[PDB]
Design a binder for these strands. Structure first.
Ligand SMILES: [Mg+2]
Ligand SMILES: [Mg+2]
Ligand SMILES: [Mg+2]
Ligand SMILES: [Mg+2]
Ligand SMILES: [Mg+2]
Ligand SMILES: [Mg+2]
Ligand SMILES: [Mg+2]
Ligand SMILES: [Mg+2]
Ligand SMILES: [Mg+2]
Ligand SMILES: [Mg+2]
Ligand SMILES: [Mg+2]
Ligand SMILES: [Mg+2]
Lengths: 337, 151, 138
RNA sequence: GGAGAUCGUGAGCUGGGUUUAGACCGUCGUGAGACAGGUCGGUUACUAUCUACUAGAGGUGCCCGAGGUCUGCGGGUAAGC
RNA sequence: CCCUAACUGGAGUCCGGUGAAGCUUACAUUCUAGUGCACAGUCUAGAGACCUCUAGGGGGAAGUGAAGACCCCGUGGAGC
RNA sequence: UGUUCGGGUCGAAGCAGGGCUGUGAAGUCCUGUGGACCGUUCACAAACGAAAAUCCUGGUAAUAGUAGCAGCAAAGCAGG
RNA sequence: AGCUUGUAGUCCGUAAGGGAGACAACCCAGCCCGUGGUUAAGGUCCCCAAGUGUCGACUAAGUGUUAAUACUAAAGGGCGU
RNA sequence: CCCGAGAAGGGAGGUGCAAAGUGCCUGAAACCUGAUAGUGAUGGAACGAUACGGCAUGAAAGGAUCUCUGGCAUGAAGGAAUCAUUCGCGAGGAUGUAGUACGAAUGUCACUGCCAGUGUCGUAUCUUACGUUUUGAAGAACGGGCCAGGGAGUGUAUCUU
């Protein structure tokens, strides 16, 4: 047979395409530190999309300097509380949690997620982790953070989302001392990400239910006379005669959307503190208006409105320092027109 | 066709039995409802069956699972056997009445035996295609039910 | 407790398999990454990369990557592990890379006949290097 | 590029050709009829039991009882060319 | 058709009632290779596999329908 | 069937399970149910022994509480 | 040609048990039942009962770890040893 | 008499030696429902044969020098261990100890109350069902969904032994 060649329908890189096991995206890897101590991650909630007219500053671009309209995505990012400081012991098997110390003072809203840890072993847990770091059992220190969505009116929930955010420093003693400084406090997103720097956005994408193979893998609809013979949105064949089994690589129906996905090199364009700077007339559609401090991310982001978005500094950022942007116009006209 | 000897005999001192003689209900769903209500008290079983008929509580279908989705709460596939619930409710009411007539207390009776038996089948026909008539039956069910104030 | 430093993989595996089929002792095999495999390095890596990328993803042999799990797999091969005798023998066997914390200060016994200096050539590679070249972290 | 997968793939499709019943042309045969010759026309049956795969759940197994955050034995990728 | 999308009504999905039929020696959670009448879920050697349920379209069961209508044979027929 | 010797409402045949004997065909015994007939010696007869014929008649499954109860005229709601 | 057609012997058909991974006809073996013993074929590192057996060499290729065989690649070459 | 809307049906109750309780004598299996025993959500398949164990049963019809555990006597085939000598490069062999101690079974004396058997499960070895067509069948060759009953060398005439 003179074979006609087509690339495989869909990607096997994201299988098994199942429902993600949490509403919070999780980071499997963290970038190596390149400077002063700081949290490597922040968490916000996606409000919606608008567009800005920013002067182009991207070096070597065709349209450098001239006006462009960049679709941005406003993200509502209030302060987060660094709840716990957790140290890990590395061995042949892998990293293992060796000890934790929780902050003495914590928000009352945390009870809806977990029962409130008492203000007990604060100095003694810290000295135990210090001794563990001194003897050499400790390899890395991470901070536990939660959002405080009680302020946000567009997000219906008031329970925090707890997640781990690695500290970015050089020496494990340095990481421990910075974590001691920031433990139990509220750190705004300006203390993590700077204006104009790339990040990575992870979030559980928009669930689309149990979708078919034509939408799930983009397979071909039956064409011509075959379009009306009884199988239009069905895959043509599930396998050969041998091997006598359906492969896992055949397109088929199943859970589409609501997967965890990571987007690289999502630039930050603005670090705002008043929601009236970006909230359009009539508010956002199905959200409301912005009431906290926000960040404007260039381009799209996985997930719908109100979804938790995890922001970390980039892990494969090709480009150098990009500088501050020059926004000429944040388009706050109505999204409903 | 006629009267049925009981599969199980509780002791006649503390026994209040009642037979649902050849009901025209679904034997599979009635069997599941009988499996559920065995071991419960008469009052709680009546309350559960009333909730079943009102579509608030579902019986768990574990043996005849096909054509039944998964119900809410901590449950596998389950349904709402309205007709089986009504017939087993009538048998439960008759058992409580027999317990009253025997001087026994229906308010403490525990259903120690509650099973179904398929009765005689009324043979029917269904006019199919190509000049053929397949059967379609009115399957009858004998519903036994024994109470007792001992457990 | 068997110290598998400088021991042939198959001879150690056969000895431990017969010992476990005697049927009383829990056998810990520390330093599993330092076991020896005779033959040239190219042939050893070729066989182990062929065996690593063999099966299907739904059915096929998920041959391990860790050195301790590879040594456990090799001892698993020389047992009737689908039987109750083999299942008990594999439950009574533990293989570790390096020295775990509970085996510090413990007493070890090494097989005389499974020694690597009985071989008469330089053609060998350690099991740790084969695991590392299979992509393992240990 | 070529080739394999029952010349992969009709309980997926199509039905164009070949391989039914009708008819025409040419050539054979006294004839009925025939042609590894051509031409026109010509019915695609089934409610999926088991298994395999794709997704979604309920249990037990492990386990102070529960919750939360993680690790990584492994599996997958072309995630780019 | 490139290249599919959205929407409408009926099915399907879920629920209440009613309610058949067709395949079926047995067992059966399989996958690879060999062997075997040379096309194996059951043999041999390995590899995997906790069970149950729901939806899905049909890879396999040389799936079911059916004493092959093609070819041959019959000191079997019929028509011409 | 002829003929010899018999058993049975103080419970025959048959039916479900079990002990014993026999290489085995099978026989005998015990437990339960049953409500009227049943064997044996020596010989003789046959409408005389089933696991199978896409066997025949009857009963009954799995499929399955599944398909159908939709397509050509989508028809019902409030009060009593 | 695991093709077709003969001839001599022995087999399967009609042949158990033991062993070759499985093997109609290849080896031991022709076999009434139970027990004990020792051997046949073949094997003794583990899977698996018994040798990490002895002596003298060879092979560095995972070659090989395959009596017979429908189940096992040649010609040619090698300052490989 | 009670429940039930009920001339349905059910319970209580009675007739009857016996419900045999209106196609009603006995009342099989297939099939279905429940209970008991064993096992069971780490698990490999002709469902079984043989041996050994766990759990449950073992009232009758089966054993009572029968079941369990030992001593003593006679013990066929076979036959050590240990030690000594000598040989062998060595693994080992030969000789003696020794045809000794042992050894299937046949008797006898103590000792004990279970054993044979039945159901299910596990462990070890062996077996890819039955009939048929076949040189060759577990066949991806044909027949059977399951159970019950029916279902195939008979008579006349003649010839031969
Ligand atoms: Mg009905
Ligand atoms: Mg008609
Ligand atoms: Mg097909
Ligand atoms: Mg034919
Ligand atoms: Mg002829
Ligand atoms: Mg029959
Ligand atoms: Mg409808
Ligand atoms: Mg021969
Ligand atoms: Mg012969
Ligand atoms: Mg043989
Ligand atoms: Mg023959
Ligand atoms: Mg018969």
């Amino acid at each position: 047979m003179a074979s006609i060649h087509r690339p495989k329908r869909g990607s096997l890189a994201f299988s098994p395409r199942k429902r993600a096991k949490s509403h919070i995206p999780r980071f499997r890897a963290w970038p190596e530190a390149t400077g002063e101590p700081k949290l490597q991650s922040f968490a916000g909630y996606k409000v919606g999309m608008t567009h800005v007219i920013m002067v182009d500053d991207t070096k070597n671009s065709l349209t450098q300097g001239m006006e462009i309209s960049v679709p941005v995505t406003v993200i509502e990012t209030p302060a987060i509380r660094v709840a716990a400081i957790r140290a890990y012991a590395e061995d042949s098997t892998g990293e293992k949690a060796i000890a934790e110390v929780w902050a003495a003072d914590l928000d009352p809203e945390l009870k809806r997620r977990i029962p409130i840890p008492a203000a007990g072993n604060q100095a003694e847990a810290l000295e135990n982790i210090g001794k563990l770091i001194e003897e050499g059992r400790v390899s890395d220190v991470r901070a536990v953070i939660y959002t405080l969505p009680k302020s946000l009116t567009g997000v219906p929930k008031k329970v925090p989302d707890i997640m781990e955010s690695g500290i970015s420093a050089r020496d494990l003693g340095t990481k421990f001392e910075y974590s001691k400084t920031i433990l139990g406090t509220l750190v705004s997103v300006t203390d993590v990400f700077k204006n104009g720097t790339l990040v990575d956005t992870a979030a559980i994408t928009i669930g689309k239910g149990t979708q078919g193979p034509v939408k799930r893998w983009g397979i071909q609809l039956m064409k011509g006379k075959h379009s009306r013979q009884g199988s239009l949105r069905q895959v043509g064949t599930l396998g050969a005669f041998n091997p006598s089994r359906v492969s896992w690589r055949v397109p088929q129906m199943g859970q589409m959307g609501y997967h965890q996905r990571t987007e690289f090199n999502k630039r930050i364009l603005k670090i705002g503190s008043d929601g009236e700077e970006v909230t359009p007339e009539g508010g956002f559609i199905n959200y409301g208006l912005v009431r906290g401090d926000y960040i404007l991310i260039k381009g799209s982001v996985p997930g719908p409105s109100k979804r938790l978005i995890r922001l970390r500094d980039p892990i494969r950022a090709k480009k150098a320092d990009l500088g501050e942007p020059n926004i000429l116009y944040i388009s706050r006209e109505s999204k409903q027109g | 066709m006629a009267r049925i000897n009981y599969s199980i005999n509780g002791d006649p001192e503390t026994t209040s039995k009642a037979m649902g003689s050849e009901l025209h209900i679904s034997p599979k769903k009635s069997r599941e409802v009988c499996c559920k209500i065995k071991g419960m008290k008469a009052s709680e079983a009546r309350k559960f069956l009333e909730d079943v008929i009102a579509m608030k509580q579902a019986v768990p279908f574990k043996k005849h699972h096909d054509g039944s989705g998964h119900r809410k709460g901590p449950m596998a596939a389950g349904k709402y056997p309205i007709s089986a619930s009504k017939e087993i409710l009538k048998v439960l009411k008759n058992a409580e009445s027999n317990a009253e007539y025997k001087g026994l207390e229906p308010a403490n009776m525990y259903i120690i035996h509650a099973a179904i038996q398929r009765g005689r089948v009324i043979h029917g026909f269904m006019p199919r295609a190509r000049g053929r008539a397949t059967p379609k039956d009115t399957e009858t069910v004998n519903i036994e039910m024994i109470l007792s104030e001992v457990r | 407790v068997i110290d598998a430093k400088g021991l042939i993989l198959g001879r150690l595996a056969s000895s431990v398999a017969k010992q476990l089929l005697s049927g009383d002792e829990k056998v810990y095999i520390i330093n599993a990454e330092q076991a020896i495999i005779s033959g040239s390095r190219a042939a050893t890596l070729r066989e182990y990369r062929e065996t690593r990328e063999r099966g299907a993803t739904e059915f096929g042999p998920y041959f391990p990557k860790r050195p301790d799990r590879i040594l456990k797999r090799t001892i698993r091969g020389m047992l009737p592990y689908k039987r109750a005798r083999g299942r008990d023998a594999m439950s009574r066997l533990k293989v570790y890379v390096g020295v775990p914390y509970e085996l510090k200060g413990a007493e070890t016994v090494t097989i005389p006949d499974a020694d690597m200096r009985l071989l008469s050539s330089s053609r060998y590679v350690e099991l740790g290097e084969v695991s590392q070249k299979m992509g393992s972290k240990f």
